[PDB]
Amino acid sequence: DKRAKVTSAMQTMLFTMLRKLDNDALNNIINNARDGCVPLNIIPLTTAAKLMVVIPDYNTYKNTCDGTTFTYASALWEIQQVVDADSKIVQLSEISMDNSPNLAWPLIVTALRA
Amino acid sequence: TSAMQTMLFTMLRKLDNDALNNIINNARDGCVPLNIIPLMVVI
Amino acid sequence: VYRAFDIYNDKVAGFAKFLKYFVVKRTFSNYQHEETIYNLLKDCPAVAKHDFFPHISRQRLTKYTMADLVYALRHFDEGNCDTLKEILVTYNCCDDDYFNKKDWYDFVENPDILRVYANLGERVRQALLKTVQFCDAMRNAGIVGVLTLDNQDLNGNWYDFGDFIQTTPGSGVPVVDSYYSLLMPILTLTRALTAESHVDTDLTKPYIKWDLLKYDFTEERLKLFDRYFKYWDQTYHPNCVNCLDDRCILHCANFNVLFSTVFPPTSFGPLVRKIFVDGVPFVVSTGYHFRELGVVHNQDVNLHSSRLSFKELLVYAADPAMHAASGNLLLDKRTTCFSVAALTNNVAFQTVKPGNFNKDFYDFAVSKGFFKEGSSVELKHFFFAQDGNAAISDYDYYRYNLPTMCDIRQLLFVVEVVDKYFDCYDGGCINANQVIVNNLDKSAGFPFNKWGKARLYYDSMSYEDQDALFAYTKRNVIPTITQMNLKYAISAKNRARTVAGVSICSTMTNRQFHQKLLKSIAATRGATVVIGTSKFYGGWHNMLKTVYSDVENPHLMGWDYPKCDRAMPNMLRIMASLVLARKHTTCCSLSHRFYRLANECAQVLSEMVMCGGSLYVKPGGTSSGDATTAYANSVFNICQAVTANVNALLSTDGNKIADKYVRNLQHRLYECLYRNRDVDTDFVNEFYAYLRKHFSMMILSDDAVVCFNSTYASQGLVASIKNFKSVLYYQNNVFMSEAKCWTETDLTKGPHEFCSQHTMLVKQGDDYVYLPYPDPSRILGAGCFVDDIVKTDGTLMIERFVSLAIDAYPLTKHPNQEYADVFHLYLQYIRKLHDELNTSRYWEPEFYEAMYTPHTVLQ
Amino acid sequence: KMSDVKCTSVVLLSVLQQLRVESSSKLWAQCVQLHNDILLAKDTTEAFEKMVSLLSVLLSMQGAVDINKL
Ligand SMILES: O=C(N[C@@H](Cc1ccc(O)cc1)C(=O)O)c1cc(-c2ccccc2)c(=O)n2c1sc1ccc(OC3CCCCC3)cc12
Ligand SMILES: O=C(N[C@@H](Cc1ccc(O)cc1)C(=O)O)c1cc(-c2ccccc2)c(=O)n2c1sc1ccc(OC3CCCCC3)cc12
Ligand SMILES: O=C(N[C@@H](Cc1ccc(O)cc1)C(=O)O)c1cc(-c2ccccc2)c(=O)n2c1sc1ccc(OC3CCCCC3)cc12
């Protein structure tokens, strides 16, 4: 009974979590290893097509996400949909040192690999 | 669930502090502020 | 002047301060002996220049030696820390006015001190290299002798070639047990091996572009060991799988702690591989790269499995490989903790509500004369509130955990002594049907907490599946995930509080491993560790009398561990785990016990934490959700106490110890420490006996009360309060101020505070006994404010008050009338509450009288 | 008059949090700061100005519990 339900839930989770990772990137990484064994930390680093940046203040934003593109994890990233701690959408033109007291810090800056 | 606010206001009356009762009376007829008081009003 | 020395000869031994550029000194035989050795050992660039002038001129030395730096940092005392200041300012590590700041020495306050210490790292690393060069020349020239820290200056040049003796060339063997062992704590405090991260070990060139796919580093580790610890005369296993006993595991894990600071942080953690299930490819952990235990490869690796059984599914669900592979790369700028990934498209912020003030009780209390403006009993404990960025702020306190390398020769002796304290208990492996589970409702951890608590999984699994799962863990590693949440608490401070829910996979196997031992300790009365001994029915009185056993000139003492759960080094936690597993000398083999150790180290030491909505890497510290954390804390507590006594008894001059037995105990303590690599079971008994007589400990998790012979402590034969401060500085990276430490000279008044409780000697039945009472503010605070689950039913309110009344009854005997009035207020309120709704009736004082009378131990 | 003001501030946040004030990060952070300051306060005057600030925050929000009725 309960064993059956928990088994079903675990199977569903594992299979759903598989429908969003398998790709040419991961396969390329796996075949570049000595025996297909790699550290777990570098998988999302070199394979993730989505990047989330939680910005605490405005100095950090200057120093990481100025303009519309930035370099991180040895890759070029392009910014879209910046969001505040109140979960409202933020426009790139609103991120300025004089406007900085009005914004609900920290800011979630999302980026795609480019 | 409104009992909490009634108890709040009974406590405020029991304190009978000058500033708190002043502000409560001001808002009594609907004259309420909009922002936090620093350490602007309507009407 | 006083300079630190490391001395061991036929009359005195220890590491203490004694009394004594172009240094000079003043016998014919020695002058001839030293000069010949120097000439045979001159062309080596790792020694200081010497001249022949009846005096031995010693040219171009520094003001302070490596011993002073080691001693100063190992016996730090902010009251008298001048020698440390001169060394730092002298070598451009900081500015002299830097010491005008408050808490400049403190690690938690002003964490910039770490940068100041790191300025000595390159200087220290140069000292290590010179030692290998020096030992190389001595080996080639055929010279035997002991290398001592005092004979090496801060520039690395060696000197004082008098202890050595000639031998046939090419067969020299230098003894470095004392040199390296005492120096290890400073290697990580100064980050000596920082230069190894650059292209050619040069601090002016870019960092090595390590291949992201590399994980092994075994050859790199061996090369690091061979470059710095070449003549360290004990086989070092880069992967601790190859060690022969737990004494080796501690030996080799200590080295891996130092060497793991040079390799990229992305190379550690679970090692994944692509396996196929019925043709579909998963990614699963088929190994693990520990910073301490090296690389561990699972032995049961299977591919193309037709179907996954319940046991197989549990391992895969708990494995973070699938969770981290399917998430987004995360770059969290709020924290300095390495982040693996985010598992959600938005970061989640959680807040802590305010307290639920109970007006009813408050209005009743004031009518009874309480809270009068000016009384000694007031409100100081409240449910504090927290804003959105509190959990991550709380998690960021793990920055206080730093890679700490231990004095291995000292730790390998302290473990034997700490082992005796646990030698009166029985334990070992037990089957799935012998395990008793209390509080089944504990969270099962991420992701298991999505579908229920620990009750569900324990019910679903059959005894065989649990048994196989435990057997599985004895040949593989299961790196589970822990989830940290925020908890409501009554406190006098607004610091946030968090509770960690460890993975169910880790708890099931741990209980089968430790439950037998844990129960044995909890069921024992009269031992040093007091866990599971109720304070009721005279227990507090019996506990105190056990502490008071036979101490000759007793005073009581207490201390605390700042940020204990966050700053505990990984070496000490691994040590605590090995001591607990020593009972499995018949239910497990060497290989079996290693795969057990690797499982806790990957599950409750450096596992992955699901804080907020994303995934981070925990650098260390204890997990409040683990069942063995309280007992592991006790082992850590005793280890720090024994370390304090060892440092106290070896840092005191043996010439001025008027006693004879103690001085013999000192000399032999040094031998078993930095010589005699075998465990001297005999001497381990005398030291354990010596401690029990003169240092009686009543230890509960990270809290202790010590009845210690004052005379011995006064003259340095036993740990004092200062000794604990010194140990915590160089073994915990925390400064422990005396403001939270108490000492008491009169035993009639019991311990000032133990487990947050006070003691008062009171008269019952023509006999004086000890009763434990709390601070009244806590008792009142917990009455005025409640966590909002009691409002549903009044019964929960009654049980809350009776529990408070039981702990409040002893106040009736307090001399202060206000205190005694507190219990009556609670009793009267209980009467009212009971009214609205012979000694078994909780609304009379007789019920609360029985709880503290030994005559009836009935529950 | 330490206990009365502290209990009043506690119940004041109890009310505020029920008005869904969690949704404003800045305002909720400010309210929590004031509340913790009041609870940690040892002087009556400090508690007074912090309490009036918190009450003004509460009472500015219109459409909340009716005040004219009281
Ligand atoms: O969280 C706790 N107390 C509240 C206040 C409270 C809660 C319930 C209550 O009526 C009265 C006051 C707080 O300080 O925020 C609490 C209370 C109690 C408690 C409740 C009733 C009677 C006796 C003890 C309590 O037992 N505990 C807590 S927090 C807590 C943490 C660890 C813990 O270890 C024990 C577990 C069981 C045996 C082995 C070690 C216990 C523990
Ligand atoms: O640490 C404690 N309180 C924290 C809050 C806290 C900490 C941990 C936790 O998860 C829950 C809340 C605070 O005051 O800041 C605490 C409080 C109280 C307490 C609470 C309300 C009224 C009276 C006493 C308390 O009673 N205790 C604590 S720590 C603590 C440790 C052990 C303990 O049991 C004794 C029983 C007899 C033998 C020796 C062990 C009790 C105990
Ligand atoms: O911190 C606590 N426990 C630790 C360590 C421990 C302590 C004693 C023990 O054998 C076993 C383990 C833990 O397991 O996490 C603790 C323990 C106990 C406890 C001790 C012995 C028997 C039953 C309960 C405990 O009672 N408490 C704690 S922390 C704690 C915090 C608040 C608290 O409120 C009570 C206090 C008394 C009046 C009503 C409200 C209680 C409380």
Residue numbers in the entry:
A (entry chain B): 78 to 191
B (entry chain D): 84 to 122, 129 to 132
C (entry chain A): 31 to 50, 69 to 74, 76 to 102, 112 to 895, 911 to 932
D (entry chain C): 2 to 71
Give sentences from the paper.
The RNA-dependent RNA polymerase (RdRp) consists of the polymerase subunit nsp12 and the accessory subunits nsp7 and nsp8 (4, 5). The RdRp is essential for replication and transcription of the viral genome and is therefore a highly promising drug target. Using RNA elongation and fluorescence polarization assays, we show that HeE1-2Tyr is a competitive inhibitor of RNA binding to SARS-CoV-2 RdRp and thereby prevents RNA extension.
We acquired cryo-EM datasets of RdRp without RNA, but in presence of 50 µM HeE1-2Tyr, as well as RdRp with 0.5% DMSO as a solvent control. To clearly separate particles with and without the extra density, we performed focused 3D classification without image alignment. This resulted in ~200,000 RdRp particles containing an extra density, which could be refined to 3.0 Å. The stack of three HeE1-2Tyr molecules binds directly into the RNA binding site of nsp12 between the finger, palm, and thumb domain. The stacking between the three HeE1-2Tyr molecules is driven by the aromatic pyridobenzothiazole moieties of the compound molecules, which are arranged on top of each other with a planar antiparallel geometry. Besides π–π interactions, HeE1-2Tyr2 and HeE1-2Tyr3 are stabilized by the formation of two hydrogen bonds (H-bond) between the oxygen of the ether group and the nitrogen of the amine group of each molecule. The carboxylate of HeE1-2Tyr1 and the guanidinium group of Arg836 are 3.3 Å apart, which suggests the formation of an ionic bond. Besides that, it is known from other protein-ligand structures that guanidinium groups of arginine residues can form relatively stable cation–π interactions with aromatic systems. Such a cation–π interaction is formed between the hydroxyphenyl moiety of HeE1-2Tyr1 and the guanidinium group of Arg555. HeE1-2Tyr3, which is the molecule furthest away from nsp12, forms a cation–π interaction with Arg858 of RdRp. Three RdRp arginine residues form an arginine bracket that stabilizes the stack of HeE1-2Tyr molecules within the RdRp RNA binding site by the formation of two cation–π and one ionic interaction. Indeed, when the RdRp–RNA and RdRp-HeE1-2Tyr structures are superimposed, a steric clash between the stack of HeE1-2Tyr molecules and the RNA becomes apparent.
